[PDB]
Write a protein that binds this ligand. Structure first.
Ligand SMILES: Cc1cccc(C)c1-n1c(=O)c2cc(C(=O)C3=C(O)CCCC3=O)ccc2n(C)c1=O
Ligand SMILES: Cc1cccc(C)c1-n1c(=O)c2cc(C(=O)C3=C(O)CCCC3=O)ccc2n(C)c1=O
Ligand SMILES: Cc1cccc(C)c1-n1c(=O)c2cc(C(=O)C3=C(O)CCCC3=O)ccc2n(C)c1=O
Ligand SMILES: Cc1cccc(C)c1-n1c(=O)c2cc(C(=O)C3=C(O)CCCC3=O)ccc2n(C)c1=O
Ligand SMILES: [Co+2]
Ligand SMILES: [Co+2]
Ligand SMILES: [Co+2]
Ligand SMILES: [Co+2]
Lengths: 328, 341, 320, 335
């Protein structure tokens, strides 16, 4: 696959799964982020929200793996599916390499989803059914009558990355996990972090241990996914699209963050006034634009990124943001 | 029992279970702590070590829940059992209240021991078969021929407490876990200036007044344990003795490794810290035994081992009216060291 | 130039050769189409050139190179990477745990930084290159008259060089190049540098017999690109180039079958023992010399879309 | 009592050195093997563990030769030291013969330690300072206050031998290395039918240093070389005056031995070694192995692997000067 040795035939993110011990707390979060309910499971209280190529699964099955996850962690990403070319080739290798299976209970005439124990114990699914017509959603879900099958929403296209926050000294443990099992490699350049990149060139999972990280671990009651980043081709248009449907972003940087923009990023070319009108951040000629939601699902938040050459994660915005509240 | 409403019918610790990813590492520790191997499982490679009313299970079965725990955490307490009046009722009650079952594979003609997922994933077993002739050891274990089945060892009598280290914020989680399922309650302890000691340590105590499970959270001793243990779990196991000086001598004879004794600055301040405590100071100083309490003379004697199973260490305690855990010794020891610096 | 390049690699700069026995590397460069074009200012080392390929014969006694050749015979004793800035690259490699190799340097010559590489050969990190600015313009003296930029038999660049390693070390050296230079893995592992130019396949088992003869890990073969193998072949054969003995004619009967269309003059390949690989379109032409520097041999390759190394030629040759 | 010409003035092993890229991985192994930490370097994070006349050095010094070596090879013997009469003479001779210097960084007011490149890159030290008061430990280490400096531990006395696993065809290289520099000689060969180990016992001219070289032929030597990321010391054998009592002492403190042979191994002992005289019941209960052939005997037992693929041997010699090579055929027949 695309990048390097993909002995697991990873083909990108398939879905991410959410659940909440409190009803009606996840549905409005999906809507303000431009996602559309498009299908409901054939027999479980489980729902599919879509935007672009992003599949968001809302799991409200009671007495389930996901509800036990939610009861301990609160509103959360409790599951994460990887696309693979052959789910048995990968499920059996992962167990041979020592992965722990998690049994997801499956109803009659429904698909058996193979899953292993992942970050915080959340299932990591290996799904080899995909595409319109043959995907797991066509088989086990029922689409709403006459609803647009592939909503575009506010222009989020893919999951660009999601992070894991991990306790002090666990990052080598979770780096090993993704290396040994999926042939992830840390990309490496040049707060402590390891950008784990998958051989498919689509899955990126950065790992953080520490403030900001320690507060997540306490509020989340464990390791887990701290933020999911959605890619868009035009963050500025996406920004306006999201704000008109109720999106709440991190409060904008002080204006002095934009005076330095030409200083720290000569000839970036971006309309400075449009980014400042919306508090959009910038890092990079390889460039990227990004902006964050507030914490919406406990301490879990969301990122919206547009890449203009830069393949990083906006790390330079810590120095930029701090040294802007230094002159303001 | 006694203290609180006891809806699970708790009646004290039943056993704690140990596993290790490396062989011959738990066995020499049980021996130097005065435990005797009394029985071996009818079919599994699991062994019963005994001293007084203390039951320790060494679980050497491979590819087991216990073996995975020890592979992830090192040599460790990999489980614990509570005596309950009715295991079927308590267990059902746990599940209804949101506990998660842990399936422990039981073989032909062995007992189905129910258990729920506990700290670090370790099984918490709920056992209603106990006492001589009726115990799970009598049913599922074979006592070594000859060997005395009620050894006194070095005089350790009962498990007094198992204090856990948990990640920051998880002390509220586990306190509520134990409150909701079992009606454990915190006992708040107060130091020498009358100030609450439980900011980062909840002395969760079962309604039977026997089970004590202190929950600790923190660049100090707790986070070092969490790293070295690779998770949350029991940091030390405290055994009660009726005479700690006598127990100490028995332990030293068979090779116990104790923590280095406090500087004798510690034993001078003893009359000032605990006026008219009445203990034979020279005896305690010779052995590095610690003394805490308040003088109504309510006192306790305690000594700790070195770390013996990874970061897990052991405590030997004699209670003489004090219901606490020796938290007065932190300040006492620090001042001893500053009078020695 | 094709993914993240933290070390600023810009392709092979040169490769270094040494021999414990004089007069034994000099003929092998000439018959491969290389020509002495410069001699060091102060050391018995000589620059042979063809296209953009820079070959260094280091004869200097009591040296880094001499000891390496003494333990491993005639050999590639060293390898240089072009880098944007070599102080940045060297410092970072040390930061990431590489070990330095002292290359002794004399008055008024260049301090060439290098780290420990395969078989302990120095991996130089060179940031001086191009017309009038290269290390050769500085540390070498060109022969008067004879052109500085020979075209030779049309060999253009080092396409790749493969390491042979002990069993199990293939993941060590893969992580060596991954961690240090962000190579990625595009029985053997083909490591590709982010510059799109440096390719270093690693082999562990043919390979055992190299390790024995070489007395350790090292560069098994060096592959040279050309724009036409047939014309390069004629050019090489005219100066005494020694190739592998040609394959069996059946190899060329299975040819059209294994490669539908392909579009290659089957006749001129066989007149020369040239081999073929690809899909059938991507393709590549290749030919190998005999073992010329101990167990070290050389490959002459022409690419026709195929990013591969002709691995299918194993089955092809042994289904013959 | 040298055996033949001793041009380097060898006088026995001095220390072996260990390093690991993971903290706390070497210390418990030393403890379960009966070693006691008796001293710490004057300035570096390096410690001296001792049992009988065995000096083991735990080298935790970062950014050092040891740490680079452990980085490549894992927990390991990163260094070996020979006692010599005159370390300046030996070292100069080694260099003149083509040995390669290894520079070990020496702090102010500490000893310059001479070392040449040895097995797998590990320094081979030449140490001419030994004896209570005159040792390199007395000079550059600080003994714990009070502690006894010559602990007997579980009764291990000296390094009997240690091996090198080398790649195929490298045995000739490493035989030559020890022959050319130190006049080690192969003095004894035990025949082993191909039922893949080939071995070469190199004996130094002092009669004390013995280094068997092992290469392969998919087995135990290649599994080491893969796990170790190269050639290196495979096991260290410690001599004891009574393996049974040493065994008891080692089991008490956590030693992890190889699981005993099947009982057929002990039924075949009289057949294999008629009238050997050893208490078979005591050996079988402990899984102790017996070999030999004039009742030349040897008792040995091995640990499990304890630092990556390095393991340890505990051996009581009763006339047999071999290495227990008879135990391969005998365990083959046992199972
Ligand atoms: C969103 C927010 C809320 C409250 C407090 C704070 C610090 C922040 N916050 C971020 O979380 C944040 C995250 C990333 C980021 O996405 C990220 C990394 O930092 C590196 C690993 C890979 C990765 O994805 C980049 C910049 C950020 N900036 C600039 C920021 O301010
Ligand atoms: C044994 C050791 C080794 C290295 C470092 C140190 C601080 C210690 N150490 C202790 O761990 C220790 C623990 C308790 C204790 O048992 C305990 C707590 O006070 C929290 C509540 C529940 C509980 O059981 C009391 C006194 C102690 N003292 C005095 C001590 O020195
Ligand atoms: C030249 C020769 C002499 C005596 C014995 C033999 C096997 C050979 N020999 C080769 O060495 C050879 C090498 C490659 C090759 O270039 C190569 C690899 O196959 C692995 C990945 C990177 C790489 O560059 C391809 C085909 C080959 N074929 C077909 C061949 O016969
Ligand atoms: C311990 C273990 C674990 C897994 C596999 C195996 C073969 C073994 N193993 C040994 O390694 C072993 C080594 C020696 C030995 O020390 C010795 C040398 O000193 C030099 C010459 C070669 C040789 O045999 C003797 C007997 C042995 N026996 C009997 C044994 O079983
Ligand atoms: Co991000
Ligand atoms: Co306690
Ligand atoms: Co090639
Ligand atoms: Co041996």
């Amino acid at each position: 696959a695309d990048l390097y040795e993909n002995p697991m035939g990873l083909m990108g993110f398939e879905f991410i799964e959410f659940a909440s011990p409190t009803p009606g707390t996840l549905e409005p979060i999906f809507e303000i982020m431009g996602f559309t309910k498009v299908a409901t499971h054939r027999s479980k209280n489980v729902h599919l929200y879509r935007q672009g190529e992003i599949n968001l699964i809302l799991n409200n099955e009671p007495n389930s793996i996901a509800s036990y996850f939610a009861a301990e962690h609160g509103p959360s990403v409790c599951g994460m599916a990887f696309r693979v070319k052959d789910s048995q080739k990968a499920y059996n290798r992962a167990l041979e390499l020592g992965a722990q299976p998690i049994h997801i209970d499956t109803g009659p005439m429904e698909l058996n989803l193979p899953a292993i124990k992942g970050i915080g114990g959340a299932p990591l699914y290996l799904i080899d059914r995909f595409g319109e017509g043959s995907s797991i959603y066509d088989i086990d879900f029922v689409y709403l009558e006459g609803v647009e099958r592939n909503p575009v929403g506010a222009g989020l296209k893919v999951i660009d990355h999601l992070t894991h926050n991990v306790y002090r000294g666990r990052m080598v443990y979770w780096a090993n996990f993704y290396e040994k099992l999926f042939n992830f490699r840390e990309a490496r350049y040049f707060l402590t972090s390891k950008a784990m990149s998958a051989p498919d060139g689509m899955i990126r999972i950065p790992l953080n241990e520490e403030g900001q990280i320690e507060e997540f671990l306490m509020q989340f009651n464990g390791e887990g996914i701290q933020h999911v980043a959605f890619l868009t081709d035009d963050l500025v248009k996406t920004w306006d699209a999201l704000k008109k449907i109720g999106m709440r972003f991190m409060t904008a940087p002080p204006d002095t963050y934009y005076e330095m923009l030409e200083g720290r990023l000569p000839d970036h070319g971006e309309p400075v006034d449009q980014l400042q009108a919306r508090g959009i951040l910038l890092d990079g000629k390889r460039l990227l634009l990004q902006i964050f939601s507030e914490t919406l699902m406990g301490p879990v938040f969301f990122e919206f990124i547009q890449r203009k050459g830069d393949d990083g994660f906006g790390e330079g915005n810590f120095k930029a943001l701090f040294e802007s509240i230094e002159r303001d």
